């Protein structure tokens, strides 16, 4: 036995929107069950950043991901957030391999959004605003248009470069575009806010009634999104109670004492596992809080992995005598 | 920058137990001062085993050990102990190198012995016992003899051919051994337990005064190895307070309520440091209970890497785009 190793660019070619898709559903639905194990992350905090380690179990494959944050890192000529992942059996312990999961780790995220949208928006959705042009705008998008056609897309960011170069990529695959306003693009069917804002981007009143938020950007104490108004008359569905909690959207409404517990509707795991109800009315406002939980992330590799000994791919190294 | 991967044979070249001896002593102090970080290990549990995720911060290197644990591998053809550790930048976060664990294991276990000893035994220690004659007992002896000229080895182990292999293994290096029964083997200056017994391997009327006990063997809650009574009348020492607490060699007495907390005398780091006593008289008998810290790990990934890079060795993965 030898140990796969995989880097970003390999794994990019191993893994399709669609099957990350379904990884994402299907692990998010096991874990509902009780069917997936998943500890809590854990933290080594650096003055300049930090590192998580994130283990998981399920489909028969375990595995951590190990994925630090270094804000300072793009002055350098760094990514902010690498991320490698080990793969493990559960059989032997042996690990079967170590590859990326920078890319694999936005990919899954917007599968995410696409899966939470798929079972948490008007199946009639057809306008698309984005709060936020930024890499993860991409992958919801992307994600997204595997489950709608998507008829008009709308693009606001505080960059406006960034936002006009969301709308030629849509522009270029058939999706009608425009660069608009944050009042005007909060106004659709499907929201989705990637942005790492401090202060509430999207104003209660922009939102209409029947429309779907993924609040996909905060991802720490403190960050948020939405006026706190919107979580206040919202179906609120979690990523991950705990997480979303601490980091997530409802984080600071929570705090703030303004939501509690009480007020989260589901997990999107037991709405997908038909534990608790989805979608009731056309008119009610809806949020899918995203966190991002390790057993996606080895969901994915799994994926990654068995293509990978499929098509023939990586460098195989004999860690062991 | 670019991913250094280093195999089993590559890494056992590239440190001694020397460097390793130096490694963890500086590793223990450091952490004992409070300039070290290990927050505590995290586990993903299976039917036929374990994974156990490690992190620690010291020495300017971040780092995280993912080590398995599967009993029935050997059945299969695997060994029952497989460890990677990932090697981290703490400015960038960046993944410094990716390399074989499971020797290293092996190796700083026996090195803290080598250093508990040197800090814990009498000075004029010669006749050394060995309760246990595999792998463990071998590096064991091997960082025991950078720290005293060993006079005469005894050796019991349950099956008679390992006792034999172990014995003629010192006799090739010029240490004069015997093969003993375990009576007459705890008899000695330093004894080396190393079995994973579940019951009391060593009774206490066959330690006689100024012995000193590395306790290495036990690994988890109810193993053990010693007469309950030679922890009621010995300075007890530890690796790590909560570790021995759970699966070391004080585990059980800990438990049945025999010793407790107040009972230890000093984790080895505070010896080292000279926050506590380290031996007093000759008469006293002392135990160093060992568990294994993920900054012993991080410690010698350190050297094995810097090394690495000196004597120009391994592959070089490029891991990100």
């Known amino acids: 036995m030898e140990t796969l190793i995989l880097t970003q660019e390999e794994v990019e070619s191993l893994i399709s929107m669609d099957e990350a898709m379904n990884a994402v559903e299907e692990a998010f639905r096991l874990y509902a ?18 590192l998580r380690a994130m283990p998981a179990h399920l489909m028969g494959y375990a595995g951590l991901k190990w994925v630090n944050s270094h804000p300072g ?6 990514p902010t957030v ?26 899954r995220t917007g599968a995410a959004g696409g899966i939470a949208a798929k079972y948490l928006a008007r199946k009639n959705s057809s306008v698309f605003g984005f709060i936020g042009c930024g890499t993860q705008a991409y992958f919801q998008l992307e994600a997204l248009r595997r489950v709608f056609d998507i008829g008009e897309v709308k693009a606001y960011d505080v960059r406006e470069k960034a936002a006009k170069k969301f709308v030629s990529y849509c522009e270029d695959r058939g999706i009608s575009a425009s660069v608009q306003p944050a009042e005007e693009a909060s106004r659709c069917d499907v929201l989705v806010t990637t942005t790492p804002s401090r202060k509430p981007v999207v104003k209660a009143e922009w939102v209409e009634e029947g429309t779907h938020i993924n609040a996909i950007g905060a991802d720490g104490p403190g960050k948020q999104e939405l006026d706190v108004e919107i979580l206040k008359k919202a179906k609120i569905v979690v990523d991950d109670l705990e ?20 007020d989260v509707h589901a997990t999107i795991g037991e709405v997908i596992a038909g534990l608790k109800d989805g979608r009731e009315s056309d008119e009610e406002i809806t949020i899918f809080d995203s966190t991002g939980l390790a057993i996606q992330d080895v969901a994915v590799a799994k994926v990654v992995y068995e293509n990978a000994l499929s098509k023939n ?7 062991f005598r």
Chains 1, 2 share one sequence.
């Not at 493990?88 to 999961?101: R, W």
């Open 313 to 319: 791919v990586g460098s195989k190294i004999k860690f």
């Open 73 to 78: 890192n793009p002055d350098k000529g760094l």
């Open 82 to 107: 690498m991320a490698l992942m080990i793969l493990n059996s559960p059989e032997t312990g042996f690990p079967l391999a170590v590859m990326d999961a920078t890319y694999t780790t936005s990919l």
């Open 33 to 50: 069950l009780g069917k997936a194990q998943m500890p809590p992350k854990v933290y080594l905090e650096f003055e300049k950043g930090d």
């Open 243 to 262: 997480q979303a909690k601490h980091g997530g959207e409802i984080n600071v409404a929570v705090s703030k004492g303004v939501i509690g517990v009480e």
